[PDB]
């Protein structure tokens, strides 16, 4: 299975586009969090299916599969957010019928901070001209490299290695310099830290919200949160 064929299977693993079915209208504090949690919940379902389509994922023990997703679900959502917003400076395209500015994130306390982290990192990927195929590998790497740590474990590293090798290949095909190729790989990988940082901040904020019973936490998003 060459790097090219592995990337193709990730493309085929891409989840479907989601909409929250909200008639276009101004966002208030209740409707905004309501929309974000309702969408995160729908996407979580598709994330599980997406993960099982990554060659070898289903061959991991159930403990690993569960632990890897409980660990990275928020990062994969944000990484998907950044890809979709890449072509729209200033905006965060959570969904076609759920688009937010920085000013809209002001109505809700603690959110403007998170949006800024997401906008800055989206902006960063935008100046590097993140390519779709790169997006695919990176998003996969987030899943496989999320949680901190024999038969199953070796398969993970083997699987993570495979995706790493797929990202190198994609960069190799851009035809750029070898120095430029190495510089691009590092610039893309260094952003994983930023995605993880916003993730920790978003769950912290989401968790506080749950405790206040201000958001309609849905079954799936709920256990992914508690985990």
């Amino acid at each position: 299975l060459s790097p090219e064929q592995l990337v193709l299977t990730l493309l085929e693993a891409e989840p479907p586009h989601v909409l929250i079915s909200r008639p276009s209208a101004p966002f208030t504090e209740a409707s905004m969090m309501m929309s974000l949690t309702k969408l995160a919940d729908k996407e979580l379902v598709h994330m599980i299916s997406w993960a099982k389509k990554i060659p070898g994922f289903v061959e991991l023990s159930l403990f690993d599969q569960v632990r890897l997703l409980e660990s990275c679900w928020m990062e994969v959502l944000m990484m998907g957010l950044m890809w979709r917003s890449i072509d729209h400076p200033g905006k965060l395209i959570f969904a076609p019928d759920l688009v937010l500015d920085r000013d809209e994130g002001k109505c809700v306390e603690g959110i403007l901070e998170i949006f800024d982290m997401l906008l800055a990192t989206t902006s960063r990927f935008r100046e590097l001209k993140l390519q779709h195929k790169e997006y695919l590998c990176v998003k996969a790497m987030i899943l496989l490299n999320s949680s901190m740590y024999a038969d199953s474990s070796r398969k993970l590293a083997h699987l993570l290695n495979a995706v790493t090798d797929a990202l190198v290949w994609v960069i190799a095909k851009s035809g750029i310099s070898s120095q430029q190729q190495s510089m691009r790989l590092a610039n893309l990988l260094m952003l994983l830290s930023h995605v993880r940082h916003a993730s920790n901040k978003g769950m912290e904020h989401l968790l506080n919200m749950k405790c206040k019973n201000v958001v309609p936490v849905y079954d799936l998003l709920l256990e992914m949160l508690n985990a």
Partner: peptide
């Protein structure tokens, strides 16, 4: 919920 989706299609 997470586990049942992991084991079904």
């Amino acid at each position: 919920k997470l586990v049942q989706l992991l084991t079904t299609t």
